[PDB]
Amino acid sequence: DRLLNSSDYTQASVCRECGSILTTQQSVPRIGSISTVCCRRCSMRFEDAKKLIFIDDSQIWEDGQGNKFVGGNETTTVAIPFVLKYLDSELSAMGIRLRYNVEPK
């Protein structure tokens, strides 16, 4: 209640694939389409992916700048204390990576 619930407790996105909570973002969709949750680490720049079979439409997403990506759709939400995000952020400044193993896979 008191060190989580009646305090912070705010769902966050993880990539089930790389186990990060820092490399997810909302996609920016074309008008009419719905936004989805994607991992910047696990996805290819669109060009580079073409340069190596056909690529399905649901597998492409875009950011605000406009770059297109392929993949990185293995995300969910987990309940974590917010301060965890801060710690993970500081650690990555120091070159350190936390990798959360999430279930179900």
Q: Which residues bind other proteins (CB under 8 A)?
A: 1-9, 11-14, 16, 19, 22-26, 28, 30-34, 40-41, 53-54, 56-59, 63-65, 71, 73, 76-81, 83-87, 89-105
Residue span binding Zn ion (CB under 5 A) among the ranges 3-11, 41-49, 52-60, 61-69: 41-49
Token digits of residue 79: 């309940």
3-state secondary structure of 48: helix
Closest C-alpha among 21, 67, 65 to residue 41: 21
Nearest distance, CB of residue 70 and Zn ion, angstroms: 13
Nearest distance, CB of residue 89 and other proteins, angstroms: 5
17 near Zn ion, judged by CB under 5 A: yes
Cβ–Cβ < 8 Å for 31, 4:
no
> 2: alpha, beta or left, given left = phi > 0 and alpha = psi -120 to 50?
alpha
